Write a protein that binds this ligand. Structure first.
Ligand code: CLA
Ligand code: CLA
Ligand code: CLA
Ligand code: CLA
Ligand code: CLA
Ligand code: CLA
Ligand code: CLA
Ligand code: CLA
Ligand SMILES: CCCCCCCCCCCCO[C@H]1O[C@H](CO)[C@@H](O[C@H]2O[C@H](CO)[C@@H](O)[C@H](O)[C@H]2O)[C@H](O)[C@H]1O
Ligand SMILES: CC1=C(C/C=C(\C)CCC[C@H](C)CCC[C@@H](C)CCCC(C)C)C(=O)c2ccccc2C1=O
Ligand SMILES: CC1=C(C/C=C(\C)CCC[C@H](C)CCC[C@@H](C)CCCC(C)C)C(=O)c2ccccc2C1=O
Ligand code: SF4
Ligand code: SF4
Lengths: 76, 42, 76, 81, 151, 154, 733, 65
């Protein structure tokens, strides 16, 4: 369940029928990951939490963007 | 203090004061003649 | 023994760091990089142009020839 | 052979020399004259595995034994289980 | 364990995250998420990774960093020297070491300090340690060469 | 002269190498040292690879296509000391590495217990059997093949 | 605890699984395993490889049978333009509907994979043409390959003798062979090409009907028997030819005349036949050289015996090398291997620059996955050659029966032999490796100059005394004239051996400092590879660490710890150890051709020039450049052109890597957790009582040195297999 | 002491580690009797940690003399 998993893809994407790969889109998962705990981390400054704009680690699901003016930094 | 028919000892790696240095003096010939690939003679 | 032959690590980590603080100092780029971050692309080490060497020393920021850094002093 | 690895030597004396090796070697069988007078190379060897712990200690001055037996039971390899 | 966890982070952290703002902050990752449908294939892991990035290691000659591409061959050699230490017998390099020792004695040049092959487990000690300082610095080079310069 | 082209006296392809490549060394319109006293591409590194002009010496030196210079050394037209001159040199230096190899060695196996005198070193480098090598005129080229290391000891 | 495996006995009642594996790998070791006698053995290899020839024709049959009804031929014989021939129809239920995508290749219907074997230009190159005219193949070869089994049995049945002592003659046989066989085996070929094929080539057909009515000429074999031969070679072929259709054909078999052509490279029609003829006297003259009863010729001892050239007065014998090469059967299968091994490459290195086929190179793929299946093998031999000549020394061989005698002395004076071998390698080692890192430290460092780069003088030299009429150059006595040949000229070296530089297919490619290294690194291979095989061999007998290493010699892998610590010190495990460098030479060598060729085709050659003189670059452009095509062939954007290949190529990287286990694992660790892992079942419900019949164990202490290998190898040899093809196919080159 | 007891002897058997080499001896056997007398000894060790072995006059080919 932890490697031949990939090998499926090759053997069946080189056979080539994506209908049935394991793609982020072919085997049933649908344009969202979101609902787990990430999305209850960047959103937690509304508990016993006091707060302070953003989260704890900007890489979390909810809100915010504007990070830096040369290149980038972290986002969801 | 050292006359004739072999002398005093020395450590495990005095080769590290023989790789480093001696050989080291040779970069010292590889900048005096900063270059080779054949060579003029004397 | 181990409480002694230990010791000579701290002392060492200590001779190390020094050649890094010295290095992160007079072999400068730190002064130059700080007024000018987002911009620079730091150095501390530089060759000496013996034999082939020099190629390794390529303009890094506050106006000098050197080899870069991926060891975040300049940032502590 | 069926266990045949030669550890023999010439002294076959066994004091501060060699003892180690699971069961296999009930020797001290004094041949009529070989110094500390105990000799040969083995007893009944159809019992135990394939060591070379056999030499490791006390001479064989030549080879020293190892696996060579081929015909190989199970009680002859830990694992018949 | 570590060597593939590394392989993970940067292919993520650049496929997404690292990239860049401009007007309307239209984000432009070091790679427009190529990850998408294409790490899932374990070839994409050299289509999209190893053969994609590393093009900076094998272009790196005549430069400034160069010492990476110029390591990346050694240490991508040293590893492919470990197998010799890993994969081999022992009374072998003995059996060999004497042929040597012989030719030695003819000129009168060897015996003193009985030259001997490697201590079964020393041999393993010179596997492993090499297989690592080989197989590792390889990427230490592979890396510093795809974040210096674009990224 | 031979398979590649001619030396430096003319070698078009070689010329282009001098120029682009190195001089793009340039490539840094400025990069500030108007007067400044460190950043030394500027002076030599080029000029030391560069003032190496239409001169490098003159060496002959064949230079193929792309004009990187090839070494024939077949003892002819000009090229003789690209192997022999630095060849006998390799020989002479080695052999006086091992002439003394077969020396701060054949001087021990004797007296009293001599069983690892060699993990320390009796005379460092040998510093006694030292010059035996330059103090090889002829030497092994006779005494090796006649006596001492004599077929007997063979 | 029962009794099974029907030949061995120690193996037969071994309660573990070894029972199995070791069964399926002692089968072919006739000499000494229960069922054997010198009478049994011999014949037990005889009706064995009558089981041979037999399996070679069920191969060839089907080779000519997935061809005749599909797999273009009444196509590709209309004109063979470099677009995708055919082998057979690929049919796997796993395939997607992109069954429609290339994979499914033009002419034919359902998907297919095209001839990369040569067959397609030799079933054709000896005539054999029309798609109504063709469908024989199996039909014969197979109404043959069954006979191949019949003797098998017939000569296995006692009565009509299977022959026992009669197996140690020589003279009689080989006095028979190198006449009866080879000679007439040629001849008869010289027969065929000429009556039925040369006509089929330049001229026109031959009709299944007539065979008398067809006459290369008007007035027959004319003189010929009339010693008058010469006037074959006048207006033989032409050049304004249009290959296969006469018109500028002419009809006078035999020549050495005309030569190359943009329309087909390949040896001329005739010449491969006067030759096949020409040699067929010499072997026939050779056959008839030894006894065979009548009372002429020779006894195969008495011209060894005290023959000897530099013997005579140099105290160095020659006793019955005959009754030891003859009483050996391993000496036999190892002078057999090699010759074959040396010539398997002479085949496959001459098969380029001189391919003898109608459209081949100027094909440039089939041409590059066919030099190598003849470089792999060939290397793969050599080893086995060297490996049955370190079995002779243990099972057979006989110190008291061979001594003072020149096969000994070879043993006796051995410590030198490996040393003056090892001295070659260590020299050929660091000295190639100085030149290649230095060559790579200098680039990167910015200085393409300073690059150390020796012209391959003694190379190109051989060729400016041939035809490499490259940009002039005298050479003292030669000049490019004054003296030319004088003794030779317009006979012999006509247009042929006159390809010169020919940037396209000149035979000889124009060699520079890139080639003065690989060429010293193929040299560091067979040297190192052989210091180990020479050594491996030169004491399967024993040595200091293991003195009495025998009665079993070969595969006794391992010994107890202590003494110094003792290991892969069976002549097998040096063979075992050898096969890595036969897999590293036969890599540097093949690697080399291709890069060269590649570049020397749909593009440059400067490429290999300043970018093979170093090392990084051998990885970058080649290795890294020229894979492109294949890997973005599974592509996140659907299955494109190739998909078999790249999946093979990663199947390539796995089978390989998964060698290592076997190779850094060593039975000890594996067995032990199987000791814990066989406390499971026994202690777990819904899987108790349930008995194995073979006791769970971990692999033998020789076995896994093999299996990691026989694993290391396919991966490796299945990777280049998929690599080159997956890149010499688009190309470009 | 009068003839030669143990003053210099080669080894010739080809199994014995220091075989063709000549090291020194000790208390060579006295009596008519057995077949493995003679201790020998030399500086150079061998494949075991301890190496000081006993060979026997049916042989010691010393040889010249
Ligand atoms: C003093 C030195 C000495 C001498 C005279 C020799 C001589 C020889 N060696 Mg050798 N060797 C040496 C040291 C020496 N070795 C050492 C230290 C090693 C490492 C184990 C080896 C490993 C070795 C191998 C594997 C082989 C030889 C072989 C040979 C023979 C072929 C020459 C060759 O191509 O190898 C070139 C020489 C080397 C690779 C040796 C490197 C070590 C050198 C640099 C020692 C330098 C002096 C050293 C620092 C001593 C200290 C000086 C002291 C007076 C203070 C030749 C008889 C080959 C053979 O058996 O064929 C006849 C065989 O291939 N040698
Ligand atoms: C392990 C490998 C093995 C394999 C799988 C192959 C496979 C192949 N080899 Mg090959 N080869 C090998 C080992 C192998 N070879 C070795 C060891 C050698 C060196 C001896 C060669 C030397 C070799 C050459 C020179 C050629 C090949 C060719 C080929 C290809 C042609 C197909 C074929 O062989 O039909 C085999 C056909 C037959 C077995 C039937 C023909 C045999 C004739 C000569 C029998 C004559 C007997 C006759 C009846 C007697 C007449 C008597 C009477 C009528 C008067 C095929 C890819 C050819 C090629 O290049 O393709 C492009 C060719 O060039 N090989
Ligand atoms: C043309 C051939 C020739 C002939 C006539 C023989 C004949 C013989 N060889 Mg031999 N050999 C050869 C070439 C030959 N060899 C070559 C070229 C090599 C190495 C290059 C060897 C290496 C070799 C070894 C190590 C041994 C023999 C042995 C023998 C004897 C027993 C055969 C055996 O053990 O197979 C039985 C084997 C099997 C039933 C199959 C197991 C084989 C495995 C390793 C598969 C090999 C790889 C495979 C193709 C990959 C799997 C396919 C994949 C697509 C799934 C027999 C006298 C043995 C012997 O008696 O020596 C004392 C043994 O020691 N040979
Ligand atoms: C790329 C690989 C690696 C390297 C460098 C070597 C090198 C060598 N192998 Mg080898 N081998 C390997 C992988 C390697 N192997 C693998 C994977 C296998 C199969 C598992 C084998 C199986 C094998 C066998 C059976 C044999 C060898 C032998 C040899 C030696 C042959 C002599 C020679 O080629 O020139 C000499 C060596 C080189 C050119 C390599 C470089 C060594 C020097 C230049 C070291 C550099 C010094 C450096 C600056 C100092 C750094 C050290 C430290 C102070 C930091 C050589 C030492 C043979 C042998 O023993 O010869 C006598 C033979 O026994 N190998
Ligand atoms: C690429 C690798 C190869 C493979 C496949 C394996 C696999 C394994 N190693 Mg391993 N190993 C390897 C190379 C490999 N190793 C090397 C090179 C080394 C050292 C150099 C080691 C050192 C090592 C150690 C020390 C250990 C292992 C262990 C294991 C097992 C871990 C449990 C597991 O997940 O297995 C099952 C899963 C796989 C093998 C991967 C999936 C395979 C795919 C292709 C599916 C194929 C199945 C399918 C039905 C095929 C049938 C089709 C038909 C045509 C046959 C596993 C069997 C350990 C163990 O036994 O713990 C349980 C133990 O810790 N290995
Ligand atoms: C971070 C590392 C480090 C440290 C702190 C130490 C510390 C120590 N090592 Mg040590 N060692 C190291 C790396 C290190 N080692 C490595 C990489 C090796 C290679 C295997 C060794 C091999 C080694 C040996 C063989 C010995 C030691 C010993 C020692 C101890 C002796 C101190 C002494 O006698 O006078 C200090 C002397 C000086 C400061 C004089 C100046 C010398 C130069 C190098 C500076 C000391 C505890 C000795 C011991 O057993 O003690 C535990 C023993 O002799 N070491
Ligand atoms: C952690 C580090 C350690 C390392 C790896 C280095 C490494 C280096 N130091 Mg250094 N240094 C260190 C600790 C270290 N230093 C310490 C503790 C000090 C304080 C005493 C110094 C003071 C120092 C000076 C003054 C110089 C160096 C220089 C150098 C470079 C010259 C190479 C050389 O030393 O031999 C040759 C090299 C990159 C040289 C340099 O940077 O010029 C290029 C310069 O000479 N170091
Ligand atoms: C086996 C060896 C091989 C040989 C024959 C050479 C030979 C040479 N190297 Mg070199 N080199 C090598 C391996 C080799 N290298 C390797 C493996 C590396 C990587 C570690 C280098 C890295 C290197 C560098 C960086 C340089 C050289 C340079 C040189 C030249 C300077 C010698 C000199 O100054 O003489 C003068 C004195 C006498 C002749 C007396 C000389 C032609 C230098 C050069 O100028 O480029 C050609 C340059 O410094 N080499
Ligand atoms: C990358 C694949 C797209 C999938 C996720 C898309 C969902 C969210 C929309 C875009 C996400 C990026 O967020 C980005 O939005 C805008 C880009 O139009 C930018 O908008 C920014 O520029 C302008 C300048 O005043 C104003 O319109 C906004 O006040 C300001 O936040 C911001 O730099 C950033 O907040
Ligand atoms: C190659 C190999 C060897 C042979 C490797 C050897 C003999 C390495 C040892 C070489 C030493 C380090 C050379 C030392 C010589 C110099 C230090 C002396 C000169 C001093 C300098 C100035 C040069 C083994 O002994 C071995 C043992 C067990 C498993 C695998 C293997 C294995 O794979
Ligand atoms: C994994 C492993 C084992 C364990 C043994 C195992 C894992 C056997 C497992 C059987 C596999 C799953 C069979 C699959 C093979 C198929 C291709 C079928 C073979 C068919 C044959 C008859 C050809 C060892 O015993 C061993 C011994 C010595 C060195 C290294 C190792 C080692 O690496
Ligand atoms: S101790 Fe070793 S006789 Fe001596 S070598 Fe034989 S068992 Fe006893
Ligand atoms: S050496 Fe053999 S016989 Fe002796 S104890 Fe070990 S296994 Fe038993």
């Amino acid at each position: 369940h932890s490697f031949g998993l990939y090998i499926h893809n090759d053997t069946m994407s080189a056979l080539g029928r994506p209908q049935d790969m394991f793609s982020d889109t072919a085997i049933q998962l649908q344009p969202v990951f979101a609902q787990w705990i990430q999305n209850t981390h960047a959103l937690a400054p509304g508990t016993t939490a006091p707060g302070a704009t953003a989260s704890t680690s900007l890489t979390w699901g909810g809100g915010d963007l504007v990070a830096v003016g040369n290149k980038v930094a972290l986002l969801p | 203090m050292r006359d004739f028919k072999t002398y005093l000892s020395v450590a495990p790696v005095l080769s590290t004061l023989w790789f480093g240095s001696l050989a080291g003096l040779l970069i010292e010939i590889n900048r005096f003649f900063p270059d080779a690939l054949t060579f003029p003679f004397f | 023994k181990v409480f002694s032959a230990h010791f000579g690590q701290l002392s060492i980590i200590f001779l190390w760091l020094s050649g890094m603080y010295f290095h992160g100092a007079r072999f400068s780029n730190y002064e130059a990089w700080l007024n000018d971050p987002t911009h620079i692309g730091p150095s501390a080490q530089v060759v000496w142009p013996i034999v082939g060497q020099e190629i390794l020393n390529g303009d890094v920021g506050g106006g000098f020839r050197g080899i870069q850094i991926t060891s975040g002093f300049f940032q502590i | 052979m069926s266990h045949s690895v030669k550890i023999y030597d010439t002294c076959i004396g066994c004091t501060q020399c060699v003892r180690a090796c699971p069961t296999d070697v009930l020797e001290m069988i004094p041949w009529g004259g070989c110094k500390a007078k105990q000799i040969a190379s083995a007893p009944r060897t159809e019992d135990c595995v394939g060591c070379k712990r056999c030499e490791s200690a006390c001479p064989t001055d030549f080879l020293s034994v190892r696996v060579y037996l081929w015909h190989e039971t199970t009680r002859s390899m830990g694992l018949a289980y | 364990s570590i060597s593939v966890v590394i392989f993970h982070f940067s292919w993520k952290m650049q496929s997404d995250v690292w990239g860049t703002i401009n007007d309307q902050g239209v984000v432009t990752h070091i790679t427009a998420g190529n990850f998408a449908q294409s790490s899932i294939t374990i070839n994409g892991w050299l289509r999209d990774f190893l053969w994609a990035q590393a093009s900076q290691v094998i272009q790196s000659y005549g430069s400034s960093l160069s010492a990476y591409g110029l390591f990346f061959l050694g240490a991508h050699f040293v590893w492919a020297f470990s197998l010799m230490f890993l994969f081999s017998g022992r009374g072998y390099w003995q059996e060999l070491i004497e042929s040597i020792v012989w030719a030695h004695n003819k000129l009168k040049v060897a015996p003193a300090t009985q030259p001997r092959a490697l201590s079964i487990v020393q041999g393993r000690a010179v596997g492993v340690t090499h297989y690592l300082l080989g197989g590792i610095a390889t990427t230490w080079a592979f890396f510093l060469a795809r974040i210096i310069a674009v990224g | 002269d031979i398979a590649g082209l001619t030396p430096c006296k003319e070698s078009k392809q070689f010329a282009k190498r001098e120029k682009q490549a190195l001089k793009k060394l340039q490539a840094s319109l400025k990069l500030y040292a108007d007067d400044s006293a460190p950043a030394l591409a500027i002076k030599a590194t080029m000029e030391k690879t560069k003032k190496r002009f239409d001169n490098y010496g003159k060496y002959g030196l064949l230079c193929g296509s792309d004009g990187l210079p090839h070494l024939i050394v077949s003892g002819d037209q000009r090229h003789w000391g690209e192997f022999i001159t630095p060849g006998i040199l390799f020989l002479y230096i080695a052999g006086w590495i091992g002439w003394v190899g077969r020396s701060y060695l054949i001087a021990i196996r004797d007296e009293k217990k001599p069983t690892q005198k060699e993990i320390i070193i009796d005379v460092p480098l040998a510093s006694s059997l030292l010059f035996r090598g330059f103090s090889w005129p002829v030497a092994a080229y006779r005494e090796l093949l006649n006596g001492e290391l004599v077929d007997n000891n063979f | 605890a029962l009794r099974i495996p029907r030949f061995s006995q120690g193996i037969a009642q071994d309660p573990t699984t070894r029972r199995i594996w070791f069964g399926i790998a002692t089968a072919h070791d006739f000499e000494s395993h229960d069922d054997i006698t010198e009478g049994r053995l011999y014949q037990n290899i005889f009706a064995s490889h009558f089981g041979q020839l037999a399996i070679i024709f069920l191969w060839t049959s089907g080779n000519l049978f997935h061809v005749a009804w599909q797999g273009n031929f009444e196509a590709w014989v209309q004109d063979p333009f470099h677009v995708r021939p055919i082998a057979h129809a690929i049919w796997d239920p796993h395939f997607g509907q992109p069954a429609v995508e290339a994979f499914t290749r033009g002419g034919a219907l359902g998907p297919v994979n095209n001839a990369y074997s040569g067959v397609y230009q030799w079933w054709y190159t000896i005539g054999l043409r029309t798609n109504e005219d063709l469908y024989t193949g199996a039909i014969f070869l197979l109404f043959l390959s069954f006979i191949s089994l019949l003797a098998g049995w017939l000569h296995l049945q006692p009565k009509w003798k299977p022959s026992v002592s009669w197996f140690k003659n020589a003279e009689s046989r080989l006095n028979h062979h190198l006449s009866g066989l080879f000679g007439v085996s040629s001849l008869a070929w010289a027969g065929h090409l000429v009556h039925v094929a040369i006509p089929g080539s330049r001229g026109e057909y031959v009709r299944w009907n007539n065979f008398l009515d067809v006459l290369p000429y008007p007035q027959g074999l004319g003189p010929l028997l009339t010693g008058q031969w010469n006037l074959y070679a006048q207006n033989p072929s032409s050049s304004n030819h249009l290959f296969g259709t006469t018109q500028g054909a002419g009809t006078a078999i035999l020549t050495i005349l005309g030569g190359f052509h943009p329309q087909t490279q390949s040896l001329w029609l005739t010449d491969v036949a006067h030759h096949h003829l020409a040699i067929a006297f010499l072997f026939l003259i050779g056959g008839l050289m030894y006894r065979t009863n009548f009372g002429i010729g020779h006894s195969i001892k008495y011209i060894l015996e005290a023959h000897i050239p530099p013997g005579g007065r140099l105290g160095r014998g020659h006793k019955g090398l005959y009754d030891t090469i003859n009483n050996s059967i391993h000496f036999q299968l190892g002078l057999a291997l090699a010759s074959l091994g040396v010539i398997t490459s002479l085949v496959a290195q001459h098969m380029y620059s001189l391919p003898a086929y109608a459209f081949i190179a100027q094909d440039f793929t089939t041409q590059a996955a066919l030099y190598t299946h003849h470089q792999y093998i060939a290397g793969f031999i050599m080893t086995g050659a060297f490996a049955h000549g370190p079995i002779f020394f243990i099972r057979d061989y006989n110190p008291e029966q061979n001594a003072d005698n020149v096969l000994a002395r070879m043993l006796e004076h051995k410590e030198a032999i490996i040393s003056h071998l090892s001295w070659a390698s260590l020299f050929l080692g660091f000295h190639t490796l100085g030149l290649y890192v230095h060559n790579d430290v200098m680039l990167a460092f910015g200085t393409p100059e300073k690059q150390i780069l020796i012209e391959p003088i003694f190379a190109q030299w051989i060729q400016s005394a041939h035809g490499k009429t490259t940009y002039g150059f005298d050479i003292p006595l030669s000049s490019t004239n004054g003296p030319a040949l004088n003794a030779g000229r317009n006979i012999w070296l006509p247009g042929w051996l006159n390809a010169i530089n020919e940037n396209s297919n000149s035979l000889f490619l124009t060699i520079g400092p890139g080639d003065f290294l690989v060429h010293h690194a193929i040299a560091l291979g067979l040297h190192t590879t052989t210091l180990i095989l020479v050594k491996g061999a030169l004491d399967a007998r024993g040595s200091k660490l293991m003195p009495d290493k025998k009665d079993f010699g070969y595969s006794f892998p391992c010994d107890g710890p202590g003494r110094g610590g003792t290991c892969d010190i069976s002549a097998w495990d040096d063979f075992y150890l050898a096969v890595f460098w036969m897999l590293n030479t036969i890599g540097w060598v093949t690697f080399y051709w291709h890069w060269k060729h590649i570049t020397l085709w749909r593009g440059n050659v400067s490429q290999f020039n300043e970018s093979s003189t170093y090392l990084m670059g051998w990885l970058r452009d080649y290795l890294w450049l020229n894979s492109s095509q294949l890997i973005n062939g599974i592509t996140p954007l659907v299955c494109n052109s190739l998909s078999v290949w790249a999946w093979m190529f990663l199947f390539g990287h796995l089978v390989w890597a998964t060698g290592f286990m076997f190779l850094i694992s060593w039975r000890g660790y594996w067995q032990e957790l199987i000791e814990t892992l066989a406390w499971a079942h026994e202690r777990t419900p819904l899987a108790n009582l349930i008995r194995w019949r073979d006791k769970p164990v971990a692999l033998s202490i020789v076995q896994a040195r093999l299996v990691g290998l026989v694993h290391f190898s396919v991966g490796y040899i299945f990777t280049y297999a998929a690599f080159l093809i997956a890149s010499t196919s688009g190309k470009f080159g | 002491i009068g003839p030669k007891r143990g003053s210099k002897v080669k080894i010739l058997r080809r199994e014995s580690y220091w075989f063709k080499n000549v090291g020194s001896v000790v208390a060579v056997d006295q009596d008519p009797k057995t077949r493995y007398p003679v201790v020998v000894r030399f500086a150079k060790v061998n494949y075991a940690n301890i190496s000081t072995n006993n060979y026997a006059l049916d042989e010691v080919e010393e040889v010249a003399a």
